[PDB]
Homo-oligomer: A and B are copies of this chain.
Amino acid sequence: NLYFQSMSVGFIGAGQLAFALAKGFTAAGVLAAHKIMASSPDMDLATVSALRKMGVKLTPHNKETVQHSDVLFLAVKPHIIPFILDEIGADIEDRHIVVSCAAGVTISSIEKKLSAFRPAPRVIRCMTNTPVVVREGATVYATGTHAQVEDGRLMEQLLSSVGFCTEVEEDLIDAVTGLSGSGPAYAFTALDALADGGVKMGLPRRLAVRLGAQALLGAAKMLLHSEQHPGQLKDNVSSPGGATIHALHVLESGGFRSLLINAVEASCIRTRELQSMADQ
């Protein structure tokens, strides 16, 4: 907690991720809102005003964010990262930890940009997801060439306050992007559809959404707290001849499992593809 005593955090970009992390960080009480600064060229988005009401300092100028922050989150779309790196590269100092949240963007490409300005930029690449907004995020991070050993420890302590966090090799991160980065969108789709199923069978929509979301939350918590395999927990629910095993059969007949595999694969591949376009 001495890490966060006087630490200042900044976000280049003031959109969904910046709000989600800033909301989670302040809710966890690890950072006061006034120690957080965000910059965006369009202060007309719904997220810029939400950060304002939160007590986060805003500015149009990315150089202002760099001069204020000790830990600097890059929270812009991936194709903007090289433009921002050209713009504020001469402003990065030895004190800075540069934490890239951008999907696909490699540590190598960031270090190559910044190293033209100062020889030893401290860079950390991260992949998280929007549920950090409720402190139930899923975060992985990889440390760059010049990151100090306390840099990774500090980063893990920070991202652990808003969910699961663990260090990985960088070559896992595109796959993590396809699973837990895109994950929430798959769950929101499933919950919308489960609610439609409830409505089709006679439930009011508000109740069907509440029950479906509670069912998913509880099942996920069960798995996280169990040493048993997912299939064994499935078997615990399914009584012989009963309703659940009948419903599992219709999922299997539609290739339900294969669709989710397809989704992780497609997101991972698109992530890889976007970065190959970027480097080329």
A contact set with B: CB distance below 8 Å: 16, 77, 103-104, 129-134, 136-138, 140, 163-164, 166, 168, 171-172, 174-205, 207-225, 228-271, 274
Alpha-carbon separation in the docked complex, A140 to B211 (Å): 9
Do A218 and B258 have beta carbons less than 8 Å apart? no
**Closest Cβ of chain B: how far from A151's Cβ, in Å?**
22
**Closest Cβ of chain B: how far from A42's Cβ, in Å?**
11
Do B257 and A254 have beta carbons less than 8 Å apart? no
Do A211 and B176 have beta carbons less than 8 Å apart? yes
If the complex has contacts A230-B192, A266-B249, A270-B243, are A198 and B175 also in contact, measured as CB distance less than 8 A?
yes
Q: Report B-chain residues with C-beta under 8 Å of the C-beta of A259.
A: 193, 250-251, 254, 256, 259
Do A222 and B175 have beta carbons less than 8 Å apart? no
Alpha-carbon separation in the docked complex, A225 to B134 (Å): 8
* Tally of this chain's copies: 4
Q: Report B-chain residues with C-beta under 8 Å of the C-beta of A182.
A: 237, 243-244, 247
User: Which listed residue (B190, B212, B225, B235) contacts A180, Cβ 8 A?
Assistant: B212
**Closest Cβ of chain B: how far from A73's Cβ, in Å?**
16
Do A221 and B134 have beta carbons less than 8 Å apart? yes
Do A201 and B239 have beta carbons less than 8 Å apart? no
If the complex has contacts A199-B240, A205-B240, A243-B270, are A251 and B215 also in contact, measured as CB distance less than 8 A?
no
Alpha-carbon separation in the docked complex, A233 to B229 (Å): 10
Do B211 and A260 have beta carbons less than 8 Å apart? no
The residue in chain B whose Cβ has the minimal distance to the Cβ of A132 is: B218
Do B219 and A183 have beta carbons less than 8 Å apart? yes
**Closest Cβ of chain B: how far from A245's Cβ, in Å?**
5
